[PDB]
Structures are given as structure tokens and as C-alpha cells.
Amino acid sequence: TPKRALISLTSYHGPFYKDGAKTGVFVVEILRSFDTFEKHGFEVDFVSETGGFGWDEHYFNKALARIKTANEVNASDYKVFFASAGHGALFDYPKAKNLQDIASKIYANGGVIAAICHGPLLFDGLIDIKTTRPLIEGKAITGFPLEGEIALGVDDILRSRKLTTVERVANKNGAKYLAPIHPWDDYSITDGKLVTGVNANSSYSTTIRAINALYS
Amino acid sequence: PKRALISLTSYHGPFYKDGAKTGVFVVEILRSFDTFEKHGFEVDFVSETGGFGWDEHYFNKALARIKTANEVNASDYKVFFASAGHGALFDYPKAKNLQDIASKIYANGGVIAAICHGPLLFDGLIDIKTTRPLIEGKAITGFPLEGEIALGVDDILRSRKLTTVERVANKNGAKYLAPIHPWDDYSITDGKLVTGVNANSSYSTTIRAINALYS
């Protein structure tokens, strides 16, 4: 009833670049999305699979300290699930079975699922409990392209560490992946109640699309 | 040469009412790594996921090179040292991969050590040689319940269905032996199983582990 959004973060705060900086959450995504939900009268909670997270070293507070474990969230409370990312999502989101039940339940409630950057990786095996089909099956989505990972010089890290891409998740789950012209473009999509965006540059636009999609 | 492996808790909180998060007590691993290096040992770190955080109440090479338990070659190491923080309360009991590494190091005549909440890692950790809980019929210390009550955190254990080192010892046919004060430097060597109470015991405990290797 009252206006509630949940933002999930990646719980993975570990080795990635090599280099030796730790990946994790990219603050700017969640800040911008935090602020936009707030400015639209939304109460915003954070959550991760384990309840933990850290900041991606290669670079509100109250809601952050008060972060729920996926275990201890009432999905019915929320009109919007917003999956933020950070290369950390490459490690946990596809296995984030608890977060996935949440988003599944919010969505089966006529809630919106939104995702940016690597956030759509959560969609891997994410089942739509009303239909029993992969939730993204037959949908168009966007998300951070392989091209962006080639640009950053971390695509070797992907094939070494056997990590996946949003495009692969799209294909694997019966969805159409649609790419931005450039990896850093403000780019997002509304497909019904499934809203996705590409990066931290799209965080504003994606959170607006999620809000709008509620009235649909 | 002679290689130690120090595991860190993977759980970066949240834990304290007051909204602070757990993770790993930095003091422990530093002193331990130092003492290990100080005695001729190459030290690597590991956590269940390869990740970690600093417990909010609060070398770099190895630490940059921190491993995920799944990628570790156990037979490489002579000593496994489980460092903690209250983060260990959430991952250590279900840290399947770190338990597997410790079991193999032990089965090969290496030492298992742990401090603080590190001994929670022993919860259903199997001595593969005897095929029973590694800590069965052993004496161990670890952060006592008295320390959790001193800290207020005992209702948290109750609410969150967490255990204590003492319950873990019980739950595995071990004897738990308490320090007088939860903050005493206190340590035990029981064969090649070596435990210590808290950060204050980090030095003692790693000294124990180094000595137990030659027993």
C-alpha cells in the first residue's frame, strides 16, 4: 500500500581486476537511484543475498546501515525491486536464489522488476512464479554489454573466472538482449513491468522507468 | 618452502544492533601473518568466496592475492590458520570449501589453528583420516559466550540461530576450555589442533601452530 522500493546490491566484495582492487557495488548507481525513488515519495530499503556488501575499489547511509539480508525481507512490502550491480554481481547475482524469490514475488504481485549494469544477471534462472517460465522469457532487456567489458580491459577476467554476460543470460533464458550504441550511454528499456538499463549513466532513467511502469 | 594459509571470514555483517557490520578483526591476521613470516613461512589468505570486509568496529600483497576457497591447492600448505571476527558466526559453520582445505592439510600432517570465532569452522569439519569430526575428543578454546554477553551480542546469537564455539565443541565431541576473562591471551595445543581465544592470543596461537608442526 504505502510506496516502497527495494534496491539489491551485490554481496560480493572480493578479487576481480587483478590488479588487486576489490570489486563490489558501484556507489553512484545506487545513490542516483536512491535519490530518485526518494524524490518520488518512495520508502527505499537495501538488501543483498547475504546482507553484506562492499564498495568497488575502482570506484542513504541510514538505509545502507539498515540493509536487510535477502533471508529477512517481506517481498509483499514492495512495489519495486531494483537490482543494482557492480562487477561484484557477476559473482553472486546468478546464484542469488533468495534475492530471486523476492523479485519473483514482487513481480507476481504486479510489482516492477528493474535492473541496471550487471543487475540483470539476477535474472538467470529467475522464475516467474505466476507462469513458471523464466521471468525474462519473451522480454527485451538491456544491461552492461560484453563490449563494455572489452573496453575496460576486464574481459580476460570474465573468461578466466568463468563469469557470464547479460547477453548470455538473455539468450539462456529466452530473452532478447538489446545493446546501447556505446557502453556508457544512458540507455534503458521498459518491457511491461520489466525495466532494465545499461550502467550508472542510465540509473536515473531506469529508476524513472520503474516508477512509470507501476502505472501500467 | 613452508606455507601457511590464513582464512578470513567472508561475511561482511550486518550484526550489531546499532547497524554496524561484522567482518574480520584485522589485528588477528596481521600479527599472525607477521609471526608466520617472522619464522620462515610464505603466507596466503583465503576466504570462502575470496571476498571479505573489515568488521566495522575496526602482507598487502598476499592480501591482494586473496584466494577463494575453491581455487586453493590444499596440499601446498603446512598450516591452516582460521582468523575470525563475528562475521565468522555466519559463514564459518557452512564454509564447506574452507573446511575441505583444512581437512586435507590436517590429513597430510599439517596443523589446523583458529582464533576467536575461528573454531566455528570446526562445526562438522571431518578428519578424513579417522572419518569423524576433526575436533572429536580434542580440547579447544575460542571466544567464550561470556565474551558475547560482555559485548551484549548474546540475544543476537539467540535471535539469529547462531552458535558459540562452546556449542560447536559440544556438537562435535570436543571439550571447550574457557579463559578466565574473555580477553585473556589464552591458547591450547592439542596435537596438531591449535586454538586461541581472541585477537590477544593471535601471537600465542600462531606460535603454537608453528611448534605443533614439528611435534
Taking the domains of chain A in order of start, what are their residue ranges?
1-216
Please tell me the distance in Å from A139's CA to the nearest CA on chain B.
Answer: 32
Neighbours of B100 (CB within 10 A): 17
Tell me whether strands B67-68 and B187-190 are parallel, antiparallel or unpaired: unpaired
B45 in A contact zone (CB under 8 Å): no
Q: Among candidates A22, A11, A119, A83, which has minimal Cα distance to B90? A: A11
Q: Is the dihedral of CA B107, B195, B62, B1 positive or negative?
A: negative
Is the CB of residue B50 less than 8 Å away from at least one CB of chain A? yes
Of B11, B65, B66, the CB nearest to A50: B11
Count of residues making up chain A: 216
What is the fold, at CATH topology level, of the domain defined by B1-215? Rossmann fold (3.40.50)
- At residue B2, the 3 state secondary structure works out as coil
Cα–Cα separations (whole angstroms), residue B128 to A157, B6, B101: 35, 20, 11
> Are B65 and A20 in contact (CB < 8 Å)?
yes
| B49 in A contact zone (CB under 8 Å) | yes
How many residue pairs bridge chain A and chain B with CB atoms within 8 Å of each other? 47
> Distance from CA of residue B5 to its chain's centroid?
11
Q: Which is the CATH superfamily of the domain at A1-216?
A: Class I glutamine amidotransferase (GATase) domain (3.40.50.880)
**Resolution limit in angstroms?**
2.0
Beta-ladder partners of A115: A83, A196
State whether the Cα torsion A90-A92-A97-A98 is positive or negative. Answer: negative
Q: CA-to-CA distance for A162 and A49, rounded, in angstroms?
A: 20
Positions of B annotated as catalytic residues are 116-117, 148
Label residue A117 left, alpha or beta by phi (over 0 means left) and psi (-120 to 50 means alpha): left
Task: Please check whether residue B186 is in contact with residue B195, taking contact to mean a CB–CB distance below 8 angstroms.
Answer: no
Taking CA atoms, B129 is separated from B34, B82, B107, B108, B126, in Å, by: 31, 21, 6, 9, 9
Mutate to test the interface with B, among A10, A12, A50, A64 (most CBs of B within 10 A): A50
Tell me which residues of A are annotated as active site.
Answer: 117-118, 149
> φ, ψ for residue B24 (rounded to 5)?
-110, 130
Q: How buried is A153 (Cβ within 10 angstroms: 0-12 exposed, 13-18 middle, 19+ buried)? A: exposed
**Nearest CB to A52 within list B12, B20, B50:** B12
Dihedral Cα B108, B109, B115, B119, nearest 10 deg: 60
Sign of torsion over alpha carbons A92, A95, A98, A101: positive
Question: Are the Cβ atoms of B51 and A20 closer than 8 angstroms?
Answer: no
Three cell numbers, residue A50: 547475504
Experimental technique used to determine this entry: X-ray
Contact assignment for A51 to B14 by CB distance below 8 Å: yes
- Identify the closest residue of chain B to A17 by CA–CA distance: B64
